[model samples]
Target: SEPFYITTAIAYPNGVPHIGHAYEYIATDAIARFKRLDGYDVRYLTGTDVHGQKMAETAAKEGIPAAELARRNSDVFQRLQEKLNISFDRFIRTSDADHYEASKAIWKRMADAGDIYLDAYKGWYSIRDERFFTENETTEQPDGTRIATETGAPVTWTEEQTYFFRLSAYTDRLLALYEEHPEFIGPDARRNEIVSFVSGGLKDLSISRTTFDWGVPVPDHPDHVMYVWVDALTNYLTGVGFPDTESESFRRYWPADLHMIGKDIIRFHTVYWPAFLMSAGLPLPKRIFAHGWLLNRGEKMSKSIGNVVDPVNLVDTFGLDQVRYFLLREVPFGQDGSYNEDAIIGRVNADLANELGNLAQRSLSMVAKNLGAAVPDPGEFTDEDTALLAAADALLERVREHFDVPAMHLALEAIWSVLGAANRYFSAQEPWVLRKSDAAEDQQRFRTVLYTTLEVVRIASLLLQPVMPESTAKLLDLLGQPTDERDFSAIANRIKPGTSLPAPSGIFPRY
Candidate 1:
């Protein structure tokens, strides 16, 4: 079977993880889960980027060593990952000993290939972002503060002798790579942005810094530290065994299937990261998907407004599944979205509580009442029953089409459409009314209808497991599916006729 190796951008843990961070982790986890359920050997990677000037300054302010600050802050993000059930195989930090080995190895490889040179980086730099910004890229603010025109981060004049990567040498190659693989970048808009930036021309990027000492040391230059982005980008390579390229994990999972990044860092991953890899004679990742920001009431969630949505707060207020669903469903991937209390409540009620949860409860409660708490024996079909069953049967293929492009909102929409039809089927063939007819045919019709409805729940919930694992698992357990019998394959295996169901329970209670 083909394997999938995917990664979320290792977030810089200068501060605690926030809802925007949660959005990326949840989306990546969902993608990894879908691939695993669809029968792939998946290696999912995520972690914190613990290097850079922001971390150094933060540590200084707290009057602690940078290393101690990094460890404590990284723990907060790791805790968030666990809280959200992000299934990252390894939560790597750039400070890891193995990471130093990996970063140095890549630096040596690129250097040996004649892609590095010593130079003085005398220019505008944003210590906040830990990257250099050209004069044109910074704007003078009304408050007499100059900031990076793109990120709005404050920049200062910095001069240091550092190593530079031959990024300019790869501009044509990068453009051609994007041209050859048009889908190399995501959402079409992001691809256009990257393509335009590269075509505008390229600059050989400064790859090491002498002023700060909190990063991976440049391989031979004792006085210089490998630039933060250079060290940070190599974490992906370290997640697998890059220095030990002959290792099985490296062979199987190298050239990652996807790199999930925020739109903010598109240039680093698509340009600098790939250029570095190419110069080092390694394969580029197949895809880079840059997603949009999460806003609160159409404003960027920021500290200035005191309205940053905390993942923990949201999880505390609403359940995990509710938050996950809202993040993925409320906005299309790669598009900016706003979430308010009402928007979340609307999705929870409309999608989970009313549509999905009620569908499960209504179907199983009748099974408990009429069918002896077991999967009812389905009878020969009526046209309506046949149509419903066929729709359920075809769902894995339908939903898969969406998960691959990661059009998850569309995937849920399709599942709910089938759910809507199933709801109508349940309403039209009122099993309670069928029982009063006292006819053998109506009794058979009632059993068939119940069986068909459960089957739809079975299939839809199987597809939905990636998005809402806990709620769907509870729903499946109530439906009497054993642990092993709940994967994508289980969609085809309708609940066994005599398999016992538990007492009916509500999985997603109304918010």
Candidate 2:
């Protein structure tokens, strides 16, 4: 299989992981899993951006070294991903030796191209965000936001001798790139926002700060250190063996297929990253997608606001599959979605517990009770069986299409529609009544009904493997099916008769 490289933004290690982090990881994880199942050699990378002003300040307040604090905080992030069952190939830290070397190498490449220069930087800096903001960049409010320049406790005006990247020179090129590749930015509105921001004009981004001592030092200039964004963006390359092209890691996964980032930092990713790549004479990533925020009760979740929803709590409340399904299904990808605990519970109950779960429970229970707890020998299909199979096949096709859009919500809806059809088919056929009669005609109809229903469950489970991996794997196990060879195409036929099914268990328990 040819390699397909992917990365999530290396998250800031200022705090513990939240719903926003989980949401992005879920989407990225699903895509990576799907690609792997589709037989691509996949490398999915994620990690923490540990060397920033925010991290330093937080560490100082805790009376600890920044490096020590970063280590502690990064471990929390890793544990959260493990609990959520996120499949990451590499966990990169911006402060690692490989990352520093790769970042410096790229910096030197840009410097040689005349893209790096020294300048005096003076601006209003948000220590919380670790970025400089101009006057017009912030809003005015009577009761100012925590992020406000005037009211923010961490805000400061800094003047320093710094190194700047020629981001301004690439404004026209980036705009042209956006125009040429409209799909480069996803969900339509995010593309428009990026275009508008670039059109407003870009300034040469200050890439190094002398005031911060907690970051990678600039090559040949020990006094100045690389800023957060410049150092953090290098993780995409560093994690896959950057600065050592002869290494198999570098040869296999350079030039990532996608770089997934949040909406707040689209400018840095879409603008600065490409400019830096162009300066280095390297290929830009295939796409930079900026997904929207997840708001709770119309307010974005954050630690300062105290509106944060812990990812671990959600996993504990609902099982892992339910948690994953709720996040992706509750909102469309790349859109701002309001989060509510009640909504999560409702989705879990309605979609997972009642709908799909019930369908599986009923079909398998009937097969077990009527057919001696074994998969029935499926007899010759009737016209009704053919129609039911055709509908399920059509649904499988629709699922594939939706999966291409990476629309997990729509795919689940399509699968459930076929599930509903199967449920109704069972009701209408009255398989239980047919099984009571000893006549050949009745027995055949009973077998057809049971076969069609169980087959539908099998197809639905296969389609759902990416979204609900553990649950679906269990479902496959119950069917006495080999999990290794399970794929979308394998759902084209009925389960073999006389194969002893494992004792049935609930696929989803209602909350």
Candidate 3:
């Protein structure tokens, strides 16, 4: 099979998993599942960035070695992904020996190419953000109110000696590349922000930190270690065997199809990573999409603020599928969104429990009681039946288009529109009343209506599997549809008229 590669940013191991982490994994996981269904040999990677000043600090407070602290925290992230049903092909850790070697090689290559230099760097660095902020970027905190950066945290300044990367060298080249390929950054607004930032000016970036001893060493230099951002970014290549381009694994997944990152690090992924790749004489990743932050209530969720929503808590409260669907469905990708528990509950009650759940239960139960326990064989379709199927067919086309554009929310909404229509069609047709009629034609009509409704439910469940995997799996099981046989492209034709469906069971119980 042809390969398709994708990744989410390796998260920092300084903290436990939160709602923000869940949101990113869920979105990227859905895309990976979609690609697999489309017959791509998908490699979806995610992991932990375990070497950083934050990790070192966390270790001191916990009275353990930094490496041990990283290991403990990294395990938490790995377990969280498993609990959330993320299907990552590789889970890398920067602390791994393979990662250390790959990172060192890339650093040497960049230095040999003259893109990296040892210089006395003086700048205002934010340990909290692990980034340098220009004079214009700083602002007063409104006399006590804290302001967060795009990553959902407040920034502070400090000074340090660092090795810097000649980021300014690629200014003209990056602008030209962006002009040539506007789709390189996604969601329009993020692309515009990158363009505007590049147009303003570019400066050499600090790439190695002398203050922290817990990170990867800078190639041949023992005095300074590679900066956290550079070390973290190297995991993308490290996961696939970097520096050894001839390696079969490297060749298979070298040029990543997509790098899903938070909007806070757009500059790092779009600017710094590409510059490093160019300096090393390597091909850039095909796309780097920076999605926006997940806010809680009206404010950004932060550990310092004590408003962070623990993802594990959510999974425990609601099922994994419910939490996953609420996050993606509530927010538009690449835009900042606020979460409200009330809103989440409302969506589940209305859409999942009331609309979809009730539709499945009522339709299937009616068929089981009237037609037979087995699925009915609708002999022929009337004009009304044909019209309903046509509407469903058109809906499938719209959903396919939406998926092509990678608009998951839009795709699900389109499917739900059809679901709503199906509910209305069933209500108006009144299959239960027709089943009691003496006329044979009426009985046949009733059977045909129920069959069409059940078939539509089956197809809709297939469409939804990418977003709400567990719920869809349950729905398919209740319908006696083989989960392994379920795929979006096969939905239209796969359900036969005479196939047996399992007895009706509630796929989504009322909350």
TM-score of 3: 0.93
Q: Candidate 1 on 245-307: residue-level lDDT in tens? A: 999999999989999988989989999998999999999899999889987775435443334
Q: Compare candidates 1 and 3 on lDDT and give the better one.
A: 1
Worst 10 residues of 1 by lDDT: 299-308
Which regions of candidate 1 are displaced past 4 Å? 298-308
Q: What are the clash counts of all predictions, listed in order?
A: 0, 0, 0
Q: Name the best candidate (by lDDT).
A: 1
**Candidate 3 RMSD to the real structure:** 3.3
| Candidate 3: residue 196 Cα off by (Å) | 1.0
Q: In candidate 3, which residue pairs get closer than 3 Å at backbone N, Cα or C atoms, i.e. clash? A: none
TM-score of 2: 0.93
Per-residue lDDT value at 416 in model 2? 81
User: Candidate 2 regions off by >4 Å?
Assistant: 138-154, 298-308
Instruction: For candidate 1, give the lDDT.
Output: 0.88
List the candidates' TM-scores in order: 0.96, 0.93, 0.93
Error of 1 at 351 (Å): 1.0
